[PDB]
């Protein structure tokens, strides 16, 4: 039912997440943004190295338990 998603930020800010395999990852993104005070865009989440779709869900990633997700501050060239 619930999977362990380790959302580790880039400033030692770690948070444990419990998400259902039926619910989308869009709500997971909303939970982290409201509990961290950062616009939905500002960041970026990754898995298996590759980026994460906004409509994604373990339904597609087959993410087992204890999995990990990386978040990177969003940026662009100059």
């Amino acid at each position: 039912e619930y999977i362990k998603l380790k959302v580790i930020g880039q400033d030692s800010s770690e948070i444990h997440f419990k998400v259902k395999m039926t619910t989308h990852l869009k709500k997971l993104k909303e939970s982290y943004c409201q509990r961290q005070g950062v616009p939905m865009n500002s960041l970026r989440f990754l898995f298996e190295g590759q980026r994460i779709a906004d409509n994604h869900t373990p339904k597609e990633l087959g993410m087992e338990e204890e999995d990990v997700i990386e978040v990177y501050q969003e940026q662009t060239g100059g």
Binding site: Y2, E14, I15, H16, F17, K18, K20, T23, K27, Y32
Partner: peptide
């Protein structure tokens, strides 16, 4: 609970 449900609670070391 009914539609969507996500529980988030960490613990510091």
């Amino acid at each position: 609970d009914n539609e969507i449900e996500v529980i988030i609670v960490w613990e510091k070391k």
